[PDB]
Design a protein around this ligand. Structure first.
Ligand code: 3N2
Ligand code: 3N2
Ligand code: 3N2
Ligand code: 3N2
Ligand code: ZN
Ligand code: ZN
Ligand code: ZN
Ligand code: ZN
Lengths: 357, 357
């Protein structure tokens, strides 16, 4: 099965990377063990949604395309390697983002930089190595492949879009007109930049390119199937599903209990431009807006409890139901448009949506 | 002239990157200004030795190769773009290394992360963007170039070697057998790993690939001149000159006054595996070794002053003179071997050596 092939390829890639460090980079066994532990701790334990989307898209095409058995095996192995490039790209951004944000946990486990024998000094570089490994595995496994050029170019643009999104996110509680490397940034007092368009831009770049666009397009590239789709349509459906995914994460940060969330949610304390804050500001009256400004972006638990009460009272659940209903209409419309050129790819998008929704 | 062409291309590359952020990445003017300031602050103000080595190697080949004038202009523009990819790669590693090390200054200016309106939260991501920009400029400027594949593959391997070297450096004061993500790392008490071979490995990977090998090989690639050299010989001369460069930096960290150094040197406090510590341990008697162990890797100024006194008393200046004499013999031997296939490239190596020495 797909998951078992995917996990087996992780062991193969790891062995290759570590053997190459020994044969070419003069690594010693203790540092190779540190790196093996770092790779397992940062890359494993999740759902592998991104990596498995590449494999699922590739298997959809295998069902409808004539190939020798050895070719089907090669395509699946390429989809697994490609899927691991995305999982390692994610691992790079989670390691770095956890250090940037001073995060404590991620999925009921301490953040990598918090491990006693790691520290921020190592962890920042470990994050750098994680991304460097994505390129090492591409050049090694896809050296003779016709899709190598397109895959490297796509991967670079998605990585860049992600870093641009991280910039939009970390600066989301500042006033744009006040941004200045020379002056410490005050948190906004007016919240004028907490709008649906500004929120959409953070989410589009920070998450949707690496979580949805990259796995779908990589599945097409390893299958040599990019002519079966209109790329503008794949972009629109990736950004749409990706946004819905983040709206879910945002609601969960505030209302999902820490035991289920796998961390203590701090979007309110961090003054993040969340779906809840933007949607609340789109419907609140004068007194509610004023109460929001006097309590948002503060570590004080009483102030955090005021914000959480305003959200519950504002009936944000109704806004979510309306938003979700709108997303369902649009996702179905885009799936219908994809069916024109590829029913197989349209079906893979339907699975990705079902897994998100 | 070469420097003026190089600096003009910086303005062109910057304009391209910022215009693309506006046209494709939905950036607003204030964030574009933040990124312009970040790029200028982290990429400019140095000697441009790495970037200018690419241009110098390319101009050596232009003097001896028949080309149309438009081709000479294209090669020089490519050498400038390539040179900026290396300067931006350096900027990425200096931004991240300064955060990793908790550095205060670099070249008489505060480290980027210390700027009031920057902070570590932004700076880590700014460092990520700096490296992402190297790939954006390669795919844009070299899209149709025959050397694009080789240049991207070389750049990736050098970037990876550099991150591996940073790992060797940050772990250089730990006992290898004790490395463990689960356990806080004690500083070595025996200093058994402060050997010439271990020192050589840190330096080879941390600095020599991006400072010497990459500029020389990029100059060959943009000139389509890689067949004029034995790559094993270019590697050996890059690693040799690169090591000598680091031995100089190490001596300067301890003995060059802070006003001239552009920072307060902390290798002793940081327990770094420096050329001075390794060379001292290679000649010290029992009492001197014991005094070294009781004072090294400590913030205490009196303890730092004991270490500095042991180095002066050990006549490390004589060891440096002997080392420098050995490097001169070997660099001349390698330059002689390079003259066989390319007197022009051998001359560029001679200039790189003269600039280092
Ligand atoms: O256009 C997109 O959405 C994705 C993309 C970026 S570079 C590249 C190269 C080849 C193919 Cl098929 C797609 C892409
Ligand atoms: O997806 C889009 O709307 C088009 C686009 C804008 S920046 C960027 C970076 C990478 C890729 Cl693959 C696509 C895009
Ligand atoms: O072999 C080296 O030292 C440098 C290197 C790494 S990948 C690559 C591709 C083409 C050329 Cl000409 C050199 C290199
Ligand atoms: O320079 C060498 O001795 C050969 C080598 C080992 S790891 C590595 C990474 C990148 C390049 Cl360009 C060369 C090498
Ligand atoms: Zn974050
Ligand atoms: Zn969240
Ligand atoms: Zn450092
Ligand atoms: Zn130094």
């Amino acid at each position: 099965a797909s998951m078992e092939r995917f996990l087996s390829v992780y062991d193969e890639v790891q062995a290759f990377l570590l053997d190459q460090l020994q044969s070419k980079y003069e690594i010693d066994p203790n540092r190779a063990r540190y790196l093996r532990i770092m790779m397992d701790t940062t890359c494993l334990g999740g759902k592998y949604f991104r990596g498995m989307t590449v494999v699922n898209v590739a298997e959809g095409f295998l069902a409808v395309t004539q190939h020798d058995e050895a070719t089907k095996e090669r395509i699946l192995h390429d989809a697994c390697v490609g899927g691991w490039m995305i999982e390692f790209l994610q691992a790079h951004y989670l390691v770095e983002d956890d250090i940037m944000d001073g995060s404590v946990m991620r999925r009921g486990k301490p953040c990598w930089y918090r491990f006693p024998g790691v520290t921020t000094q190592c962890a920042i570089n470990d994050g750098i190595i994680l991304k460097s490994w994505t390129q090492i595995m591409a050049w090694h496994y896809f050296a003779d492949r016709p899709f190598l050029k397109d895959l490297l170019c796509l991967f670079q643009k998605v990585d860049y879009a992600t870093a641009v999104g991280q910039m939009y996110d970390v600066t989301s509680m500042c006033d744009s007109n006040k941004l200045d490397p020379e002056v410490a940034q005050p948190m906004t007092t007016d919240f004028a930049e907490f709008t649906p368009a500004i929120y959409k831009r953070i989410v589009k770049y920070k998450t949707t390119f690496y979580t949805y666009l990259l796995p779908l397009v990589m599945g097409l590239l390893v299958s040599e199937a990019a002519a079966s789709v209109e790329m503008n349509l794949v972009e629109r459906v990736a950004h749409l599903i990706g946004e819905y995914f983040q709206v879910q994460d945002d609601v969960m940060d505030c209302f999902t209990p820490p035991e289920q969330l796998g961390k203590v949610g701090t979007d309110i304390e961090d003054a993040k431009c969340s779906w809840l804050a933007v949607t609340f500001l789109g419907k609140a009256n004068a007194a509610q807006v004023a109460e929001f400004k006097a309590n948002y972006g503060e570590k004080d638990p009483a102030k955090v409890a005021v914000v959480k009460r305003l959200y519950s009272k504002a009936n944000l659940q109704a806004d979510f139901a309306a938003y979700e209903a709108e997303v369902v209409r649009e996702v179905e419309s885009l799936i219908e448009q994809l069916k024109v050129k590829s029913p197989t790819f349209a079906e893979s998008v339907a699975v990705v949506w079902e897994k998100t929704h």
